[PDB]
Amino acid sequence: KEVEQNSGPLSVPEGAIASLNCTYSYRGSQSFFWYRQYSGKSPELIMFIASNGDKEDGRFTAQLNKASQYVSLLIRDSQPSDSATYLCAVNFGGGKLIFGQGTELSVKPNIQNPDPAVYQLRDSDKSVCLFTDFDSQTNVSQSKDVYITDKCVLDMRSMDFKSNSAVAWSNKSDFACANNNSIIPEDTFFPS
Amino acid sequence: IAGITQAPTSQILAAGRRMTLRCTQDMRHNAMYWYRQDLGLGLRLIHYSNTAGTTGKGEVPDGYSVSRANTDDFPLTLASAVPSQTSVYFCASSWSFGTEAFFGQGTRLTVVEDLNKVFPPEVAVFEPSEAEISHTQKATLVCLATGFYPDHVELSWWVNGKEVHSGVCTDPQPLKEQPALNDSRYALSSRLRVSATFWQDPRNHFRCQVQFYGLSENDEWTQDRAKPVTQIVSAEAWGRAD
Amino acid sequence: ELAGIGILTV
Amino acid sequence: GSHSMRYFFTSVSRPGRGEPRFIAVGYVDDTQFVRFDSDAASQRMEPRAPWIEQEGPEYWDGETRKVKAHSQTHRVDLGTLRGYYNQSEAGSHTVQRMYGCDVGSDWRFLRGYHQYAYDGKDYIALKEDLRSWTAADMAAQTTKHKWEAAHVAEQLRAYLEGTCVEWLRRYLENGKETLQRTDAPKTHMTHHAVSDHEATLRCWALSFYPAEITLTWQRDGEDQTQDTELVETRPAGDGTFQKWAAVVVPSGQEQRYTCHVQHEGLPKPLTLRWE
Amino acid sequence: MIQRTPKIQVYSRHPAENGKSNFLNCYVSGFHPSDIEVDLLKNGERIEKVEHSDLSFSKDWSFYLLYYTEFTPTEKDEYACRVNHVTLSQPKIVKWDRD
């Protein structure tokens, strides 16, 4: 028992070096594991380490110091696909393998031409407004009233272009596009 | 090739019933593990088994049974299902005790006090804005699945009958429509952006496909309207030149 | 201290 | 001086369906400090030294879990080897395992051992380089292939070079009064006429630590080596050891024979004769 | 299956003196398999309160054990060690010699 990591969530921009750490209680621990868990998936084994020191596996690096009960993982060239919950596992003798809480790592995309805008959509039953094309630095609120979701990053692949987006919807006729508790830039393009 | 398999990958339980998650592995592994993950934390050790024929109790063993009759199998049995046992259960296996553990596919398990609180989603697709076309030359469609319980949904985008993975973005976890309730229904949204030229082509067929995991054909219901079974709910829209 | 690794069945 | 830490494991299948026996013991140099016995009522790793009792509860729980894992591994190994050699389930067989590390006085890694035997014959052993195996027969080759496919020699290298040395140093510091001590031998010589003209001299060295000691008989300035009755170094039960060596000499010629004693606690070697 | 016959050595912890308490020891070694019967004898009668060390083995895989009990040696009393093993058709008795 007692395995603890950097709680998170942490944010590292695309192409940079990220660093996660983890401590444990049992001094006699002799094997340590780093796992990668995407939302809705199972832990995919990243690395294992046993001897004191450093271990290189491509972009990933494991460091281990038993003298201070410390283990850590370093990631080079942080890619958007590296955004995931990283799990620290320590073996406490026998089959007692204990995991930490997991550190959620978010790799931020590089935005080409920020162009904040808000639009309106339609269908056959509710009303949906879309906030899009803003920088990754912008945060999104949820209070208001009406349901408001979180920020999401889409990759257009061939266009070498990514974009941030967020959605709000309701069935109340008093709902509108310009109706936005979070700080939003004033150049938000509105339809006309 | 050899691997590890859990079964089922999804199951809804009425409180009081019994259910056993099977876990098997081919690759001659001695050690096997049963972990419970609640999404507010990491996964905690339920049970472990160093060898075939021997078992061990771990970090959270309260309420669970196990058996290691042979090397390949290590099932996890819940005798009296209680609502607090709603979690995602993972099975693992390793060559020797202390070596690297390899996980399976997981099992989303939800125990409900009342089966009448399970609901399938209402999926609707919203067409892009002409102003977004005039300003950005890109069109974004918004899929929205509303009013379902529990969180067992998997959304995907299909264009002309073929699934796409570009310009798509689904919310990480659903929202609560009435968050004060422990049995509050959930909602999920997703986005699909493609060029305005692609949207204005009236031949394109856009379909949002939402997989909902619910009851099975062996689950008793006995109510007037309908029972939520494991099904696919799709909502589609077509392009137009305007 | 005992070895926590490297003990495999024959 | 030079130090070492070694663990010994014995698992015996008992004829029938009875629970097999498992005994594990741990030594620092020549001093036992931990043990486990499957027939005991504790079912936990127990201390057999004053300085190892200071360790925390997490230490004892981890050691208990690991020694139980060893026990279960051997439980499987008994039936597996029985099937390997087409042996009957009516007999009793024995699996033995030994592993540890030796240092070179400066507490730096010197050697590492992991050896495995079925009944009383060698089955498989990790070589000196801690990366290759030595299999004794054609089933030990099957086990060898299995352990190479699972990279056991790598893990055992990590233990023998890393954890074993660390905890050997930690054990040498904790209880330095006991482990790093050196007890000088207390010696004497006895004379017994086996007949009228016969004689024999016994050279006795008692209460010495560590157990390594050299007793030799020398006649008129040259060692005899072969003409002696030397016995195995034995324990007294108090942490020290005893050893004696007898030589047959003619009566009146007891002064031709001298006993030479060498031990750590003696800065200069000793020479005794029938006074 | 190869078997080995126990070496038996009877002695005392400290040099013996009549009227002074000591520990009678019987050290067996170099035997296989591990099961072995050992009793310490006072004037031919079986001493009940006997402890023994934890079973270990030597560099050639053969086992060794130390059975011991506290005793006050006298000039009249004689002590011995009685050991039975699968390699012995009968128990082997080693008398206690002061040398």
Automatic annotation (TrEMBL), chain B:
Keyword check for Cell membrane: yes
Per the UniProt entry, what is one GO biological process?
A: immune system process
GO MF terms here are:
metal ion binding
UniProt organism field = Homo sapiens (Human)
Provide the Ig-like domain boundaries: 121-230
Q: Which cysteine pairs make disulfide bonds?
A: C143-C208
Official protein name in the record? Human nkt tcr beta chain
State the source organism's domain of life: Eukaryota
Question: Binding residues for Zn(2+) 1, per the UniProt record?
Answer: H135
Q: Where in the cell is it found?
A: Cell membrane
